[model samples]
Target: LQDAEWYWGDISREEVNEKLRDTADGTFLVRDASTKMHGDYTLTLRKGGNNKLIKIFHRDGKYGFSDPLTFNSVVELINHYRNESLAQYNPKLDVKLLYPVSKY
Candidate 1:
């Protein structure tokens, strides 16, 4: 049998957003991300130290490092925005037909 090694690397924004849709709670948080005064925040997803479980963390929050949000799967870290905006959104549909007045 052959062996496979799990690795880590960078990802795209669009790709990550799609993954967040199928999460257990279907939600993730980013605190103190408003202004520089609130301090910069970093979102990280990696294997945990203890049991090698998948974990997500938001560093440098209002007080400091916020509580880690653990996830069994590495999905998109977005969707809370989409969930709220699309909740009450409605699209408009309007179609009109035009005909030639002068013919040969």
Candidate 2:
């Protein structure tokens, strides 16, 4: 699998907001899900001066945006969303992931 530069692990939710606050709409990052769902992940995006967090589910053997159309990896899911609209999944974030807040 490909190791993407957009994943920022083990950080707090408030920090996520900080990172995304100044970014443009659709700029995104993947953070460690949290204590509630420790093994999973969350897609945190910047939109209209707000940060939106979406959970990633690992179910039936694949990773996905809580949909039947799961991808082999989180990287694949992100790549697809970058070029596609997320209105179906979330109307509030009715925008494509145009920019990625790449990790160092």
Candidate 3:
């Protein structure tokens, strides 16, 4: 939808509620278009993918799109991130475990 301004990569529980309250359908994407080193973090709204709330983050000359989180898929997505992050994390507890918060 147009006029979509929502943040990702540190989205609070409150912000998520605000969106659910506004849309009520529980299916949308809050895209963050901020670069890691520089750029404006603009949010855009998109309707369901894999039938859930999905987010795409762009930062620091790099970008990634998170899989949709539905009642069923969020855990898998988190686990996948965790598994991947563990390979690179020295202590296996760096940033990826944060899930939608830290890219690591």
Highest lDDT model number: 2
Give the TM-score of each candidate. Answer: 0.21, 0.72, 0.24
Per-residue lDDT over 1-104 for candidate 3, one digit per residue giving the tens place of the 0 to 100 score: 12321234434435644554454332332433333435323323322212233343434433333523232333343356545652442464433222232122
Worst 10 residues of 1 by lDDT: 95-104
Give the residue spans of candidate 2 off by over 4 A: 66-70, 91-93
Each candidate's number of clashing pairs is 2, 1, 4
Q: Which of 2 and 3 is ahead in TM-score? A: 2
* Winning model by TM-score: 2
RMSD of each: 20.3, 3.0, 13.1
Q: Roughly what TM-score does model 1 have, to 2 decimal places?
A: 0.21
Tens digit per residue, CA lDDT, model 1, 9-54: 3233333334433433322222222344443432322111111112
C-alpha lDDT (0 to 100) for residue 12 of candidate 3: 41
